[PDB]
A paper describes a structure:
Glucose-6-phosphate dehydrogenase ([name]) catalyzes the first and rate-limiting reaction in the PPP; the oxidation of glucose-6-phosphate (G6P) to 6-phosphogluconolactone with concomitant reduction of nicotinamide adenine dinucleotide phosphate (NADP+) to NADPH. [name] is a major source of cellular NADPH and has a primary role in controlling the metabolic flux through the PPP. [name] is catalytically active as a homodimer or homotetramer. Each monomer has one G6P binding site (i.e., the catalytic site) and can bind two NADP+ molecules; one is close to the G6P binding site, and the other is the structural NADP+ binding site.
To elucidate the molecular mechanism of [name] inactivation by KAT9- and CBP-dependent [name] acetylation, we determined the crystal structure of AcK403 [name]. The protein crystallized in the P1 space group, with eight monomers within the asymmetric unit, and the structure was determined at 2.28 Å resolution. That said, the structure of AcK403 included an α helix at the N-terminus (residues R9–Q22, hereafter referred to as αa’) that has not been observed in other crystal structures of human [name]. Lysine 403-acetylated [name] was crystallized without structural or catalytic NADP+, and a close examination of the structure revealed acetylation-dependent conformational changes at the dimer interface and the substrate binding site. In non-acetylated [name], positively charged [name] and R370 interact with the phosphate groups of NADP+. Following [name] acetylation, the acetylated residue adopts a different conformation that is stabilized by electrostatic interaction with R370, excluding the structural NADP+ from its binding site. This minor conformational change in the structural NADP+ binding site was accompanied by distortion of the β-sheet at the dimer interface (mainly βN) and unwinding of the short αl helix. First, the newly formed loop (formerly αl) reshaped the dimer interface, in line with the observed differences in the dimeric structure. Third, in AcK403 [name], K205 was rotated by ~180° relative to its position in WT [name], and held in position by electrostatic interaction with D443. This conformational change was accompanied by the unwinding of helix αf’, the disposition of helix αf away from the substrate binding site, and the reorientation of functionally important residues such as Y202, and H201, that together rendered the enzyme inactive. In summary, [name] acetylation-dependent conformational changes in the NADP+ binding site reshaped the dimer interface and propagated to the substrate binding site via partial unwinding of helices αl and αf’, disposition of helix αf, and deformation of the G6P binding site.
Residue numbers in the entry:
A (entry chain E): 5 to 504
B (entry chain A): 5 to 505
Write the structure that this text describes.
């Protein structure tokens, strides 16, 4: 039997209600700092709406917008409601949602503006007691000011205070440390939520059960059995005339140093002492501490060019973006190989491969197993694989050999679906991002990057990023819609990976 | 895409043709010694018919019946054809089949009778050159005479000569050795086919690919990961007024010392040097040599009694069989635990559990894996299993833990079908026994018990069988249609097995 999207929300609501960590009865205030900006308009307001609509917020929740512009809730609603995908059935819930919304104009480094915000909050029903959740939907160039002022003027004295922080988390170890040390002098680790929009909560929890609940998979999750691991993140669209911001960061900073490294950690970790957030993040950090600074011989960069035979956007290269400097050498593609130098993984290449303007949307973890030690089937045996796909359609499946009916033993490659076993025919999930914000309401930090974790991430990548900035290597061109530079394929072959 | 019975036979015929082992061009003679008897009538003639019909015999194959009774092919046909399950589509093939049939009346210890059989064979088209395949469908009490006479009078000088031999393969080490030494002084090991009717050729070959072609299963196929192995053989019917012959053997000799021990060997074997029959049988023998003589404390015997609440035969106990001695102590049920004392298996109980008048038909291999080393999911994790069912309906599947959708990590037990992977939806195969006779045409001895293998099988069980015969322990009663004596459950719990509740 299948589970609808609405039945999954019933199960979740019931779990939130039974559990101590989500306080359904207490008052909550959700503060969107930067409520006028595009992130708020297109992602945050719609998503807090989805939570509200799904019955997954505490019943007493208020949304307070705060930005420089002098706006009404009516304005917020006009700019944001198109991205809510609201239906006619939801007209009542949408009224009730907007009734819980308010806006406060202010400057980001003006103490008086923050006192108005605090008074505004205090003036809500039970505002002085509410749990306060601050979403910092702002460039990190104002984070020092905003976190300073929030701490001085805006903290609940009764409820908890939690802040959600957006990438970039610096651009290297030293800038990351300046920002992280600043925020840490004001907020405890258990108040800081560094979010990863791309972390697929359902698939990472599937993976943990698959590995840690089962003798079939746990004993082969090591270098004696695994030839390589591939972490793939692919977008088919380029920068869409908006690449100016990206151009200052590049693909490694954008998605690899943060998101792909988290996935590596979840694949490579030792079994945690428990499923508590900090036991799990302890094991994520132990992994990073076993990884050496990556060197350039393990890296292939590319930059997309237009396709002469394309139509629409496909005909334009990265440099044809009007907001991108002519002769920028910033990479829109990287393939990178890391090693986890410990008992479980030494020698196993972890291959991170991502880019824009590629052939498909795909986000995926692939374990490719070694060949059998001694093939009694005339070399017909392909390497087994375990694939966890997140980004197009979620799936867990194992590629393996099976007998073809007939005389003697002719194995053929086959696939089995391990997504929810035999149990559930269809499963329609809540948005992963919706679930991630819900985590912050529940006090669950497992899938958010910890300070120690972040430092290790920057140590790994920083020598290389500095070297790229100083040596300015020309990245390899690749046609829009292709799989990227063929040199990425060569790096993968060279370190142990097999295609056909 | 699903595969019909006819499509599977197309694939097999093509394989027989491309392979050097089959010889689609040679003439073959299939001799059913004991053609008048029940086994021929109900199993052998039907099965050689199914081979013929399926297009799996060499084009020039003759079937020669031989027994004492003075019969025609018309007689054979009348008694056997009901068990052929022939349809209207097959009317022409059935004519063609019976045209290839002949019968010779003869005594089993009469050299003149065997010369007539040899002359009869020589007189067939290319008879003097044909491969000759002798099915000894006779009690083993005449095997010495029959194999002596066949060797003296009936061997091709040009084609190969192969004999199929039926259990019982003796009743202990000494009797087995007398019979086997006799047959071996006349026939090479490559001519002797000791058959096991119950060996499911398709599932055994599936299993070999599953284990040996994959990193998923091969590395955990050992004592570090497997808590116990269960080999189950269950019939829901009792002896049906025919238990007189069984009564002289008991359930261990009947199905365990032969069939279940072969299944153990296929589960426990090391990876062979190749898939050649004798590399594989070498590994089956290495296993047996690592097994000690089984002791009585590891054995539970039972004997069925009638069910007061039943209907039909279910109301009658084993002793209510008119052909069974009053107060026979013969076991209709056994549960036995063996150990393979080697690097791969030491400590792992191999539990052989079989009998008659039980709750269902089942033939099955079950690997129960150890619990996870430290459970971070609050002890909700059940042991993984790999199950290969042969009857009632073939299946390979794995019990494992999966995440329930929702907030935390609530694993639930689930089953995955591994049989043909995703590839083949529905599959109708030829009978395993059909495939086993075909193996003899192909020269493939993999699934037939070898002389050295047989000796090891008897060494393992002979002290116990002698002890049972001499101390005559009373077997434990169990109601017809139950799962057998609950003491069998206790032996299984005692050695490390976990029930599902």
């Amino acid at each position: 039997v299948a589970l609808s999207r609405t039945q999954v929300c019933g199960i979740l609501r019931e779990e939130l209600f039974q559990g101590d960590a989500f306080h359904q009865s207490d008052t909550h205030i959700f503060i969107i700092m930067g409520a006028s900006g595009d992130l708020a308009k297109k992602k945050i307001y719609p998503t807090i709406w989805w939570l509200f609509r799904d019955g997954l917020l505490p019943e007493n929740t208020f949304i307070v917008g705060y930005a420089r512009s002098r706006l009404t809730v009516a304005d917020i609603r006009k700019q944001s409601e198109p991205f809510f995908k609201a239906t006619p059935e939801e007209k009542l819930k949408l009224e009730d949602f907007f009734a819980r919304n308010s806006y406060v104009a202010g400057q980001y480094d003006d103490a008086a503006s923050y006192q108005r915000l605090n008074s505004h909050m205090n003036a809500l029903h039970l505002g002085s007691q509410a749990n306060r959740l601050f979403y910092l939907a702002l460039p990190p160039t104002v984070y020092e000011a905003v976190t300073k002022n929030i701490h001085e003027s805006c903290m609940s004295q009764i409820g908890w205070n939690r802040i959600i922080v957006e990438k970039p988390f610096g651009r290297d170890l030293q800038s990351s440390d300046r920002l992280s040390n600043h925020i840490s002098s004001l907020f405890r680790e258990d108040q800081i939520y560094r979010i990863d929009h791309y972390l697929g909560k359902e698939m990472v929890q599937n993976l943990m059960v698959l590995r840690f609940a089962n003798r079939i998979f746990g004993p082969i999750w090591n270098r004696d059995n695994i030839a390589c691991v591939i972490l793939t993140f692919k977008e088919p669209f380029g920068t869409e005339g908006r690449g100016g911001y990206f151009d200052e960061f590049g693909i490694i900073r954008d998605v690899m140093q943060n998101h792909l490294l988290q996935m590596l950690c979840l694949v490579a970790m030792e079994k945690p002492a428990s499923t508590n957030s900090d036991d799990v993040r302890d094991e994520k950090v132990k992994v990073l501490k076993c990884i050496s600074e990556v060197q350039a011989n393990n890296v292939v960069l590319g930059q997309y060019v237009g396709n002469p035979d394309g139509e629409g956007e496909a005909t334009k290269g990265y440099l044809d973006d009007p907001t991108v400097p002519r002769g920028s050498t910033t990479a829109t593609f990287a393939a990178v190989v890391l090693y986890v130098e410990n008992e479980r993984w030494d020698g196993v290449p972890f291959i991170l491969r991502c880019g824009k303007a590629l052939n498909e949307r795909k986000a995926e973890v692939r374990l490719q197993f070694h060949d059998v030690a001694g093939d009694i089937f005339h070399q017909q045996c392909k390497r087994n694989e375990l694939v966890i796909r997140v980004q197009p359609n979620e799936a867990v499946y194992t590629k393996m050999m099976t007998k073809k009916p007939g005389m003697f033993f002719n194995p053929e490659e086959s696939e089995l679906d391990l997504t929810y076993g035999n149990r559930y025919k269809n499963v329609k999930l809540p948005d992963a991002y919706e679930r991630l914000i819900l985590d912050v309401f529940c006090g669950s930090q497992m899938h958010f990057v910890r300070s120690d974790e972040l430092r290790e991430a920057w140590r790994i990548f920083t020598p290389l990023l500095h070297q790229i900035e100083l040596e300015k290597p020309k990245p390899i061109p690749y046609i829009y819609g292709s799989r990227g530079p063929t040199e990425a394929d060569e790096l993968m072959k060279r370190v142990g990976f097999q295609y056909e």
